[model samples]
Target chain A: TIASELKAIGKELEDQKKEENIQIAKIAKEKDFLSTFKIDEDIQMKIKRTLYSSLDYKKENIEKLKEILEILKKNSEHYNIIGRLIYHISWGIQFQIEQNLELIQNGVENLSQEESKSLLMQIKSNLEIKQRLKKTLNETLKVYNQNTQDNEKILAEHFNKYYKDFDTLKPAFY
Target chain B: TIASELKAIGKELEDQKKEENIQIAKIAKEKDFLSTFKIDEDIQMKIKRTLYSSLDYKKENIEKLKEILEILKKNSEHYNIIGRLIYHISWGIQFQIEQNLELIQNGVENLSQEESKSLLMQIKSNLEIKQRLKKTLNETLKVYNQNTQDNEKILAEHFNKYYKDFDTLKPAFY
Candidate 1:
């Protein structure tokens, strides 16, 4: 069960984090007398300090990711369908960081990924399955003068308009 | 070998269809002109001819479905991707058929399926794995009407609007 594993790993991460924190405190106790020297007339400057640093993220995120996993695990349609949703979302974290989203270019976000290497010109067929070309298309929607002569007019006017991301189309067969 | 199976099935469908057509013609001969009398025939009409009815749909669509399946099979996707994709498309088709398309008081085309399940209503969370509302929407590009009140003014107005179809998306991790 991916959901079960996701939740378990999440809990395991927090537990290990707690264990590390406990060890930090325990070790700090052993060296308790070592950093006892007071600095600047009684202001204590302990050489040994115990605190969650980057370790803070594990405990915090695990609980949250688990909660998310919990919801997706019990998601109505997906509830019985798949064991984990967070488990699935986690894949994008790795891929987005690695793959250029454009593992294929020019058709950057345009062409289908699998069919690009096919030998022939298209026939009564094509790889572009989804075709969403802004039911709303306009020259302004495309290229505004923000970077060109159009900026001259905009610099004078108070309206600060810039491009907003529109929903985009991607092609896939499956 | 999902790809192998997909390609095999495609060829098999073609072969089977060819066999069916041949059998239909061969069987058409065996019956030797049975339903020859036409109900709307003239008074001097004779009574004998055999025809193969119900030979419909499979050739065009199965070839198409197999081609689609082939593409998806090779898609850089999860292991059970076939199951998930099939599941998603099946839901849309079933839902489109059942509810006012709204599922109703029925093309219940007026209704949204995933929205009514009474689960926690969410924004980003949706079940539209196959967003074919219809990439070609109604198949015919027919109801392009009710949308503009009149393409008539533009029938001569010189605005060429066409439908866009894109293949698609779905999620999986396992």
Candidate 2:
């Protein structure tokens, strides 16, 4: 029973995590779309407003992600979900940092060739760091899921053993 | 318990799916804004680029959706989740196809009446397919959530039965 219960919980967490990932990807795509368009003064102001609004949306999502993590921590017998959520959050933050760096590089690249080269070097460094963070987060989540599966399997075995013994202990009367 | 867990997962998936739908709607609105402006080479290229990029994004999303389906298949109890993911992916793909068809139709509509009529026919067929896929995905996810709710109810009944037996054994053990 414990094993089944934990598996149920883990499944729910996985669903939430996947949804969050899709949301982030959608937002990133929108931001990229916005970047592709040229903005005039009036439109630039409007775009700025949109960016600020998006930042607020991102903050809200982060809060929601944290809330989910809190629930997982409270109900989880092990720290797998919580640890993975933290790792995901870290990756999200790093993604934002890389986005900002890219934005800066784009502006710099629009200047002289020397300036563009310098900014390109900076972007390369930032990208390397971002890649490492993403890889680490992926590894951490994989390990967490593997550990969780093992835990659930062990619990299921124990429950099956208990049920088998109980069946053997038939009532003596009636 | 399984039912409850499924319901939770289904709700999250549906919510994220809705968000993605909304985002696509917003993109359409943005495209409308571009269309309202003067038709120039630059504007045409921008429109083409947006459509092309969106197509690529949808292709990538389909791959992720496959991964999600694989994960759901890990547990036979999550047949509903697998079905929902598959439906959504199909819907997303069809949606992109419709978008591309519409773009193409509009591009050629100004050429000649005969060309416009042929393009319109093609678009109509694509639109019909898109609508069918959209309905299927929505209905599948709805049923998935309903099944989850049913499962939770079953788990609750089991919990009650255990509680009653636990009460009976408590006095002797204590």
How high is the CA lDDT of each candidate model? Answer: 0.27, 0.39
CAPRI accuracy category, model 1: incorrect
Candidate 2 vs. true structure, TM-score? 0.26
DockQ of candidate 1?
0.01
Per-residue lDDT of model 1, residues A1-174, tens digit only: 233333343454346446645654664554323122213311211111111221232344323323333433343543322221112222222233123222322222333435432211231111111111121112212222222223233221211111111111111121
TM-score of each: 0.16, 0.26
Model 2 Cα shift for residue B30 (angstroms): 21
Residue ranges of candidate 2 with Cα displaced over 4 Å: A1-174, B1-106, B109-114, B165-174
Worst 10 residues of 1 chain A by lDDT: A158-167
lDDT by residue (tens digit), candidate 2, B32-106: 232322155443433333332333325443333233334445666645433332233333444554454444434
Return the lDDT, model 1, position B67. 36
- Cα error, residue B119 of model 2, in Å, equals 1.6
Cα misplacement distance, residue A105 of candidate 2 (Å): 76
